[PDB]
Paper text:
Here, we report the atomic capsid and in-situ structures of the tail machine of the marine siphophage, vB_DshS-[name] ([name]), which infects Roseobacter. The [name] virion, comprising 12 distinct structural protein components, has a unique five-fold vertex of the icosahedral capsid that allows genome delivery.
The aspartate (e.g., D27 and D108) and glutamate (e.g., E32 and E57) residues lining the tunnel form a negatively charged, almost parallel helical track through the tail tube, equidistant spacing of ~16 Å. The inter-monomer interactions within the same TTP disc are dominated by backbone hydrogen bonds between the β-sheet layers, with two electrostatic networks for assisted binding. Specifically, β5 of one TTP interacts with β2 from the adjacent subunit, forming an anti-parallel β-sheet and an extensive hydrogen-bonding network.
Residue numbers in the entry:
A (entry chain G), B (entry chain I), C (entry chain Q), D (entry chain O), E (entry chain M), F (entry chain K), ...: 1 to 130
């Protein structure tokens, strides 16, 4: 049961936390393939190839490392679900591909920014901080 | 009327409970085929081939057997809906295929993990614990 | 205005009530066919062939006749919307085809089971109990 | 502003109110066709052919004229939105085609029935009761 | 900031307000077309042809000018968002094509009517009442 | 953390604030392309071409610069998320293409207007006001 | 506008409906001959000799009169496009020549049979059932 | 822009509309002849002789003037693309030669009939109805 | 209405089912001959000589009796459209000539094999299993 | 990147736009001739003589200059792919030979006309409008 | 049921896998010869001579062994449908004749290459890897 | 795996990129010759002579080097599948013969141009840019 309010995201290439974070997310998939013949009871399957994707939502501030993210950039990410304290696992993604951003606001809210990324060629490598 | 808060899931291959569980689910299907002729009142049907699928949601903790689950792995599962007390039925699935995982968090919550699996070649075999 | 809390479902073949029931449902359809010509005001229609389908949700208990239901089985059903008291209509379905089941649970609930069936060759025959 | 709780539906062929009604509905449509050329500012349209459809929901009671409705029947309907008092408009539909029914219940409710119909060859003819 | 409760709709051809109104709506669109070549950074666009559409919902009363609206009719509309007081802009639509109507009711409500229209050949012409 | 209630939008061509604003929004995308061969573990990707889109919602008033916006117009926009005070970043979009508008009202509300635009040939150019 | 789902085909010689029918078809042709001279504006034509052909597709069942059809057989057919009710026209073909059959199936379908015939010496004689 | 749903076809000889029409079609051709010499840049051409052809598809009904059409008949046709209202052009074909018919049906459709004709000696003469 | 998913094919010479089947097919033909004289209304026909042909598609597995099939082999086949249960008709072909095979695969599929055969000297002999 | 919705076609002889256009097309070809000797690696080629062809599709209206087009006519065409604004290239074809026309309609469409032409003796001469 | 995503192709002469593969295919044929006499029921056949052919599609990369393939080359191929693991059958073709290649691309795709080959003098020799 | 959206085509003679490209394509062939004798098992083959062909599709713009391409011209081409960056292979074709062009448009599209060429005397010479 990790705290959840200690989550830290970093741009690994430049070494700088994101900023006013609100939520993160991650995912992993593999495609399936199913087949069966005339006279079988159950159908078989297997997994071909894998992906990864995720996003995060921050408060919009122009003076942040969150501002430099632009669609099409390649960035090395590190997600700390439980903080940076030693022994806390962190998923590090190499070659993360930023796909789209979406800024918005309301008459009674704070301008928010949603970055949405993807993986390109590599998969999230789990690890344990020292 | 089983308790519901006693549900236990196990990795049958290695023999280790999952961890901080939140909910599980299971399913079974068979495809249908319908036909009728010119001049019939009702249409006929039958079932061809079967499947199974399900998922479960846990609290994210790196030091757990829940962490070793990766998309594409083949694992032997056992679901105890009412606990491990003798005489409690348990659905055991052989060759379960883990298909996708999805980790997430919020600024006021606990990091959660959703594993989502499938069956490959075999179907859930009901039984009764000794 | 039937009571609704007296509803009874039976496996007609073996003669045994289902168990801890939560809700039932039923349906009937007929396909439509519409046509019109160049210079018509309204379009005509008619009904070709009929079906039936429904489901029900029970509390999961292994020691019940609800447990023996498996996808692909053929079972003779009888639905008593208002109980078994004499003069209460009951829809009896012959050759009901059970299509899928879906068991689930939560950390603060009761394990539930949803059976989902269909009709194959026959249609629900209304009647009046003696 | 009609009362709404006085709505009466009738089977015009046999002359018998439906029963414990809960809600009714009606509709009318005409298909559209749009076209434009290279160099036009706005696009033109027109309406080809018309339909009608609707439904109503009643409490399930076997001893009612609502029970005799079966998918595929042809029935002459009359809808009184504001009651049967003189001078109250009523939409009368000839050759209404009943398309599907759907009975259901819950463990804490009343068994309900939803009839769903259509029009075949004719359109709803408004009128004013004497 | 117009009042919103003063909105008036008229049938311009005959000169008669609608009746017990509940809400109106309007819309305008133009289709887009996008293209790009091998080696471009951004994609270009432009707008081809335009439309208009909208609806309104009234209380069902047979003795109203709202009753004469039938699918397929051509009517000249005028929408006064802020009333008929001098200097209040009003969108006047010529050749409005009424496409569908949908009457309904409940056991504890008022019978309502939803008219749904379109434009055919012309576009809404803004203006300012004298 | 920008205030959010100070957001200002301008028509850059004519130099005039919009009016009673309620909310704005913006977006940027780039399409993705994925490929893999027989015998690969992960799938590769890259981004081809980019877009931009957004909208904003105002109170409907005929005597405003918001009224002159018509579908199909080309307008130069400037969005000030945090006001016009010096040092506040503003996204300026050149050649913004207005795509659709949607006016509406209720019996207990204020007539609202939703403008919905797009970009054509250029992308939002961030900057910092002097 | 005949129903289409009432179509009946018969072997007139033995008097037995076909079986589970799916679709029928028929055709009639006459060859053309065109000629023109040096200095003519349009070309002339006429029709020499006529034929007939068609087919039908049934569900494959060995215990049917559909099974006895073999390529090369001569059979007297009668096609009822709208059923056998009195006053319904039926095309009766004498000396129909069955030319080819084609049985097939899939892993998720019903074995189907396509009979394909021709006419030999006579042409389809329309009539009206008594 | 003619309506298209008002198209009327007539047998000019007997004066009777066809019936439930679905679509019509027409055509005109002239053969080409090309030649060139040793040392020319472009090739020359001209048109020798002309034809006409077309078809139409109706719902199959034995009690119609559509039923009397048989391959080999000579019939005088008139096609009204936009109806019979005065001032609407109509292509009248003299000596139309009916070449083939093709009736068909499905288990969920309406029996359709496709007549296919030709011209013999004359060409379609355009005109304007009075 | 045979099940279709129970179809069994056998090599009659060695007595061994094929394997993972996907679909089968069969055919029978006879050539036609048509003639007519100067002054006849319809043309006559008859059938000269017959053939047979078909195929089937299996999943590619080297350890199967499907693997031993090579183009040019002579094999005795038996097709069970509805299984091997007693009373189920089966078409037995003697001297079947295997004509061609075609193996293929995709990056996300299962390697498939299509055998395509013919008959040589004999025709399919229908029968009924004991 | 020309707009495409501004395309204008003209009859150059009489000076009158076509009408409700839907699409145009054009083409140019030259025949090829290939040869090689005993002992050559690649084969040679060259182009002998050229042609041109194209078509266009309009909405059928009798009161248009599109109506006067008849197969066999010689007409001087001018195609403006991007409109008639100054500096817009236009392909002018002299002695265009109209080869065939094809009118058609549907029960839910607009009567369309497809003109199909050719070139005779001359080739399309590109130019630039003043 | 081989995996299908493990398929490996090799140039046997030089010993080097192809590269980014997408799909392969193979085929075998033998010509047929049919004859019959005046007075026979069925027609006889036999197979004369055999061939082989196939292709495969790869991603275009100049730095690959796929690049060295040129039309007219003679290459020794080996196809591993299920990978190179021991006991996996592989079809080895000697003297494969590469017949044609076809490179292509799109504005939103990956440049692909399709090699298309044939056999010359020898036939595919099945085997089993050690 | 080349990007595919970076493809560049050049007119090598004048040194000027084409323009708004959409897709390219290329091909190479060699004819085959097969022979066999009375008493052989497989048939032999070989390749005689080679060709090349391809095309590409661009947006129609008169102010481009794409406009100067005319059927019959001889042009020296260079295709860069992966761009002009150093080390990227490019197929250079000498003496390319342009065979035909085909311009077209729609009422909701962009005027497109398809050039279609051939090779004359030489074959595509692969290379590697410096």
């Amino acid at each position: 049961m990790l705290k959840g309010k200690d989550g830290v995201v970093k741009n690994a290439s430049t070494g700088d936390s994101i900023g006013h974070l609100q939520s993160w997310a991650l995912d992993t998939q593999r495609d399936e393939v199913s087949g069966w013949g005339m006279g079988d009871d159950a159908e078989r399957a297997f997994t071909t190839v894998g992906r990864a994707s995720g996003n995060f939502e921050v408060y919009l501030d122009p003076a942040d490392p969150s501002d430099d993210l632009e669609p099409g950039d390649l960035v090395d990410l590190e997600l700390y679900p439980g903080g940076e304290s030693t022994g806390s696992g962190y998923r590090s993604v190499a070659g993360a591909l930023i796909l789209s951003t979406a800024e918005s606001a309301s008459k009674d809210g704070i301008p928010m920014l949603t970055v949405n990324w993807r993986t390109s060629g590599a998969l999230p490598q789990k690890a344990t901080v020292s």
